[PDB]
Amino acid sequence: MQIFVKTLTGKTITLEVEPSDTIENVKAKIQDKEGIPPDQQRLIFAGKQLEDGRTLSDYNIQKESTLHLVLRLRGG
């Protein structure tokens, strides 16, 4: 299976995973494929902010589940 990731500028990237792996694993993968450090990354799906320690399977993620990536200054 695979999932889709949305940035704030609308460009589309494609992944290649299974119903497994963790949020830190996928943020490291996005760092690898885009050069964005994990502290400069924020993930939103189903209108909520994701958790680093949790995995993708616990968030009920299926094939081509189009998630979104968010950039914050933090920024308070």
Binding site: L8, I44, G47, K48, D58, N60, L71, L73
Partner: protein, 1234 residues
């Protein structure tokens, strides 16, 4: 400090204008300014800052091309200006003066740094609350919702509030602007779940329809998917009622203003389940049950679900009462499917027929009648075959209300006349279209006699009172879409949101007193023109003659088996049943009643014989009697001519009066007195108005020269006079009322005294007396209470309750008071409870609403309930509570228990006080109950008192019951959750004792023993064996038992009986002595003080409206709800998430496996009382929640325990992992809790 700080303030504002030449110092300038304004007040702020120059500089920063990429500065500028006009409301328009709104749109056009966008959206939304149209004026407001799926929560919901606020001030010229945003709000409304997001997207959609219903091309806005989600948003229970009504308001306008999608609402979407699921949310059993469900449905939703279904259908052939005109609705030649189009109607009629049946509001009946004669005109002969039954009885119930129309003056009320005219028109249409199908059933249910009587009545009504005394029969169809815009309402501090303009649809035409008769005479003449046209009725007459014959045997049970054997075959035919009219036509009810109320046979044998024959058709017999009572019902529901409807606004009423003592103060003084309080409180009002001889002036209120006591209400006797007069009640609010009259607060003694001299109102029920008599006989047989509730009487009583003025008037209709006490089985338990609170708890506990603002603001000043803390010690919880009654027994204050040298207060200690005290009333050492007796101290079995010892002292057992009475009475008045364990028989002895003119112990003896084994089966079988062989004297002496009380052999039944043994000489005396002792004279002494103490708080006489088996449940027998589905529906969850969560599924899976003791242990710890409140977890306020609990510091949450913030009401659940450790942890908590 202001002058010193000004040289830094103005410098920072200057730096904001210097942001062009200084892109970075302005950052901290804006930060420093925005920080301080948030921590100070506006009145200092207003006198210092040049706000116009502030916003000019901010616009210069936000619009400069140099500082576009200063994303770390644009955030700060937006935040600073947001806090600028957050504190100063009038600065909102100042920004609008220089095109700030168009500037802030540009940022949201393209973003690569969201922390700016979540500030811009959060800020521009706060503009839309004031200048909703100014945002709408720019007209590209689909920008705000393009980035919906990137905003976390607050921005995600503030990007909708702005659009809704700009979607509420819409006018005709903004048609294209809404088309701009509609494609971007359509899917996010189609996929939303948060409530503060679905309560804004419906206000916006309501505002759209409020303005654009006249604009052309309005059919293309609300497309199929959007109206489909609006339809399915009602079929889900979580949607509140307030949004539920709004959704129907949009949906009916989308069927009225157009026809293209009004066709869709009947062809594509399903309307039957649309109506069904909205009603069933208020149901109680999942196996419903349409008839009982509609009783609990609110009237507000009943109005809307009917005024929408009438709009969905095109108007009728003759528009007596409907006032619609719309052009494109004469297309009822389209009959392509007799299923896709007609399966709607053939099962919709069995919906709104019941809506009419179980509702009594004028608007609801009018709407539903209009809908009936609107939809029946569409069906044909083929489609009508399956709808014959319900309509006949419905119209029979409609036009049999003739008796209510006549006034005490002999005059007329137009309200009943409109209903009669509508029913007659429906009858005309059905007889004109389906004569062959409707001739038999109308004759069988007897409508022709009714319409003849109504023709006579219409002829008898006077006509010459016309002011416009030039009336022709053709005054037809005056204004019928001049009347949908005439009253549409909608033509400073900041609110939460901009409320859309309240649309008011009008489909009614008000009928004049002459026009109703003009239509009615012609209608009755017509139906009589079509009026022109079995031996089973003669068999009913033969059965009546047989019952009236005293030659028939009626003594042994062999007689009564044949008494009902013929009756069952006479009434219930293999095909249909005897209607409610034919049963009471030939006097069959009278024939049954005369035999029931004259025969000397005991009630036990009668009940046994009835149950031996009517084994499986008890409800089939109940329905015929209920229909008969509904038709024969003659009681006129009262009304007071309210100008504020059935709400607290009707509590806020006041009337100008000129009180006249039957100087000029006692004869002419215009003062607006509230129409709520009593004559005791009328004395209080005149005492207040005196500001002292007026204090002493207790009056015999001779309003119209009537000696009525002090117990009534300010307008109580006035309203009673205007009922015996039966004048125009509307003038009563305009009349300066000539009130005619002649001449312990320590607790204080509550003003529950409205019914000291009204409980004995023995009102005649007319020809329905026989029906009520055998209904009371049937309920005395101990049969289930399935169909004992009368639909229309319950509806009438509910309509009486939601008239706050009459309920608080103390002039409740005496038929209701008689029917509740005498026949408490015709009403639902909830209705009877509401009747109990209003008739029992006093004005202080009545006018304080709980009937769901400023309407009660003037009423809470005189109708509030007062708190009263009570301080006790834990180790002296029982004994101190005893003196608590002696001091504060009959107070109106809500009890509040406090424990000395302790800080934790609230409902916790209050629940922990009487819950422990009740168990202290289950102690064997007190010698109060039957402790079997054949280890500990507490009684764990069923609970019932023991007979006294006449020789021994008993000064304490009676006193303890006297205290228990005031405890138990105090419990119900405060809706306290108690765990006490009473027996069904104990309250049977209390209902029977307090009922006047009936023996407490039944004179029947085998009824008494059958009532005994519910207390002790050993003695019951011993006694029935004594009865069984009372002739075998060899066996009677084999027991060799003297006249000593069994179990307690120290008490003699009769003097000298301790020596005499049991034989056939005096076995009957032995039986009647042991019965008299264990159930009666031996135990009545407890009861005479129990009721004595019970009536201190409020009289037990009110409690007779309830049942013993429905009092044990409210006192702590009811089994609680613990099923899989019924619990998480009462969860609200949130914060993780609820999904999955694999910690919630198992947490609800464990709570179902609890035994009867684990449940009590967990509930006494989660709540404080060991048992669940009334009606399930719903009554818990608020609902019990599930909240995430993180891991601190590093140890796993699979070791910790479920936390509570000590306000629960709820729980916080740590991340457990394994099922077994969950079972260990939760148990260890619940047992370790106690």
């Amino acid at each position: 400090e202001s002058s010193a700080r000004n040289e830094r303030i103005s410098k920072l504002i200057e730096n904001t204008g210097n942001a062009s030449e200084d892109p970075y110092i302005a950052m901290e300038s804006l930060k420093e300014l925005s920080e301080n304004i948030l921590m100070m007040n506006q009145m200092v702020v207003d006198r210092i800052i040049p706000m116009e120059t502030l916003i000019g500089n901010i616009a210069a920063i936000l619009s400069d091309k140099i500082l576009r990429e200063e994303l770390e500065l644009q955030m700060q500028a937006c935040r600073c200006m947001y806090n600028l006009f957050e504190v100063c409301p009038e600065s909102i328009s100042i920004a609008v003066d220089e095109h700030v709104i168009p500037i802030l749109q540009g940022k949201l056009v393209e973003i690569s740094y969201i922390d700016l966008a979540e500030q811009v959206l959060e800020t521009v939304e706060y503009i839309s609350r004031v200048h909703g149209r100014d945002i709408l004026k720019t007209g590209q407001l689909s920008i705000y919702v393009q980035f919906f799926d990137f905003l976390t929560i607050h921005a995600q919901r503030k990007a909708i509030a702005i659009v809704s606020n700009a979607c509420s001030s819409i006018r005709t010229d903004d048609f294209k602007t809404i088309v701009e945003v509609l494609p971007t709000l359509k899917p996010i409304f189609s996929n939303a779940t948060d409530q503060p997001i679905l309560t804004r997207l419906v206000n916006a959609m309501y505002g759209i329809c409020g303005a654009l219903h006249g604009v052309d091309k309005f059919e293309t806005l609300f497309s199929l998917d959007l109206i489909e989600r609006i339809v399915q948003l009602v079929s889900i229970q979580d949607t509140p009622l307030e949004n539920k009504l709004k959704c129907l308001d949009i949906l009916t306008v989308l069927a009225m203003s157009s026809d293209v999608l009004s066709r869709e609402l009947r062809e594509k979407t399903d309307i039957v389940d649309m109506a069904t699921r909205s009603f069933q949310h208020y149901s109680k059993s999942p196996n419903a049950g349409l008839h009982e469900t509609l009783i609990y449905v609110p009237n507000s939703l009943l109005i809307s679900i009917s005024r929408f279904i009438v709009v969905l259908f095109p108007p009728e052939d003759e528009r007596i009462l409907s006032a619609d005109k719309y052009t494109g609705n004469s297309d009822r030649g389209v009959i392509s499917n007799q299923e896709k189009f007609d399966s709607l109607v053939q099962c919709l009629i069995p919906i709104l027929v019941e809506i009419y049946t179980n509702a009594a509001d004028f608007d609801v009946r009018r709407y539903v009648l209009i809908a009936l004669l609107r939809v029946v005109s569409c069906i044909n002969n083929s489609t009508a075959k399956a709808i014959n039954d319900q309509l006949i009885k419905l119209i029979g119930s409609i036009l049999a209300q003739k008796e209510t129309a006549s006034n005490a003056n002999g005059t007329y009320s137009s309200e009943a006349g409109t209903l009669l005219v509508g029913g007659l028109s429906l009858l005309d249409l059905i007889c004109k279209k389906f004569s062959e199908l409707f001739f038999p059933s109308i004759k069988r249910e007897g409508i022709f006699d009714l319409v003849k009587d109504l023709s006579v009545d219409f002829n008898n009504i006077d006509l010459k009172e016309d002011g416009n005394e030039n009336i022709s029969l053709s005054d037809e169809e005056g204004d019928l879409h001049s009347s949908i815009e005439e009253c549409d309402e909608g033509d400073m501090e900041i609110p939460d949101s901009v409320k859309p303009k309240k649309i008011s649809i009008h489909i009614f035409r008000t009928l004049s007193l002459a026009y109703i008769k003009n239509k009615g005479v012609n209608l009755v003449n017509r139906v009589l023109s079509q009026m022109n046209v079995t031996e089973e009725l003669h068999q009913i007459e033969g059965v009546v003659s047989i019952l009236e014959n005293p030659s028939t045997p009626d003594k042994t049970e062999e007689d009564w088996k044949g008494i009902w054997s013929v009756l069952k075959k006479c009434i219930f035919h293999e095909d249909f049943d005897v209607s409610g009219f034919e049963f009471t036509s030939t006097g069959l009810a009278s024939s049954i009643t005369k035999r029931i109320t004259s025969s000397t046979v005991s009630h036990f044998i009668l009940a046994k014989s009835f149950l031996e024959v009517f084994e499986d058709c008890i409800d089939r017999f109940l329905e015929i009697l209920q229909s008969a009572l509904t038709r024969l019902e003659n009681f006129s529901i009262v009304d007071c001519g309210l100008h504020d409807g059935g709400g607290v606004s009707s509590l806020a009423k006041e009337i100008k009066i000129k009180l006249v003592y039957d100087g000029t103060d006692l004869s002419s003084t215009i003062v607006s007195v509230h129409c709520i309080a009593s004559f005791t409180s009328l004395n209080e009002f005149l005492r207040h108005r005196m500001v002292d001889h007026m204090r002493k002036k207790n009056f015999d209120f001779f309003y119209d020269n009537e000696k009525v006591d002090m117990e009534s209400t300010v307008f109580g006797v006035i309203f009673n006079t205007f009922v015996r007069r039966n004048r125009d009640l509307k003038t009563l609010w305009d009349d300066t009322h000539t009130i005619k009259f002649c001449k312990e607060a320590n607790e204080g003694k509550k003003l529950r005294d409205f019914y000291k001299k009204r409980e004995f109102a023995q009102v005649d029920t007319g020809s329905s007396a026989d029906i009520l008599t055998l209904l009371d006989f049937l309920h005395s047989c101990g049969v289930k209470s399935d169909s004992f509730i009368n639909s229309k009487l319950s509806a009438k009583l509910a309509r009486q309750l939601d008239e706050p003025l009459v309920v608080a008037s103390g002039a409740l209709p005496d038929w209701s008071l008689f029917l509740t006490r005498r026949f408490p089985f015709l009403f639902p338990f909830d209705t009877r409870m509401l009747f109990l609170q209003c008739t029992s708890f006093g004005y202080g506990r009545l006018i304080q609403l709980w009937k769901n603002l400023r309407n009660d603001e003037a009423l809470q000043q005189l109708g509030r309930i007062t708190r009263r803390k009570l301080r006790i010690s834990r180790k002296t919880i029982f004994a101190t509570g005893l003196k608590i009654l002696s001091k504060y027994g009959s107070s109106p204050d809500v009890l509040e228990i406090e424990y000395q040298e302790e800080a934790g207060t609230g409902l916790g200690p209050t629940l922990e006080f009487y819950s422990v005290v009740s168990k202290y009333f289950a102690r064997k050492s007190l010698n109060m109950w039957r402790c079997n007796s054949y280890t500990d101290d507490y009684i764990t079995t069923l609970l019932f008192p023991e007979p006294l010892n006449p020789f021994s002292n008993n000064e304490k057992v009676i006193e303890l019951f006297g205290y228990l009475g005031t405890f138990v009475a105090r419990s119900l008045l405060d809706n306290r959750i108690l765990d006490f364990r009473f027996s069904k028989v104990f309250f049977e002895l209390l209902h029977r004792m307090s009922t006047p003119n009936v023996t407490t112990v039944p004179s029947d003896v085998e009824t008494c023993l059958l009532m005994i084994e519910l207390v002790d089966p050993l003695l019951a079988k011993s006694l029935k064996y004594i009865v069984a062989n009372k002739d075998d004297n060899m066996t009677l002496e084999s027991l060799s038992l003297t006249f000593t009380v069994p179990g307690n052999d120290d008490i003699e039944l009769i003097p000298g009986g301790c020596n005499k043994s049991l034989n056939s000489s005096n076995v009957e005396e032995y039986i009647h002595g042991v019965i008299d002792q264990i159930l009666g004279k031996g135990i009545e002494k407890q009861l005479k003080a129990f009721i004595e103490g019970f009536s201190k708080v409020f009289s037990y006489e009110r409690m007779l409206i309830l049942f013993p088996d429905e009092l044990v449940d409210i006192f702590g027998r009811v089994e609680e709800d613990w099923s899989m589905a019924t619990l998480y529906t009462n969860l609200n969850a949130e914060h993780g998430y609820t999904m999955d969560s694999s910690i919630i599924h198992d947490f609800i899976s464990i709570i179902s496996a609890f035994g009867k003791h684990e449940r009590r242990l967990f509930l006494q710890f989660l709540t404080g009382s060991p048992k669940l409140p009334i009606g399930g977890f719903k009554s818990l306020n608020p609902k019990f929640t599930v909240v995430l609990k993180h891991a601190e510091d590093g140890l796993t949450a699979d070791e910790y325990l479920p936390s509570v913030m000590t306000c629960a009401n709820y729980l916080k659940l740590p991340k457990y992992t394994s099922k077994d450790i969950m079972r260990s942890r939760l148990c260890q908590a619940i047992e370790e809790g106690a």
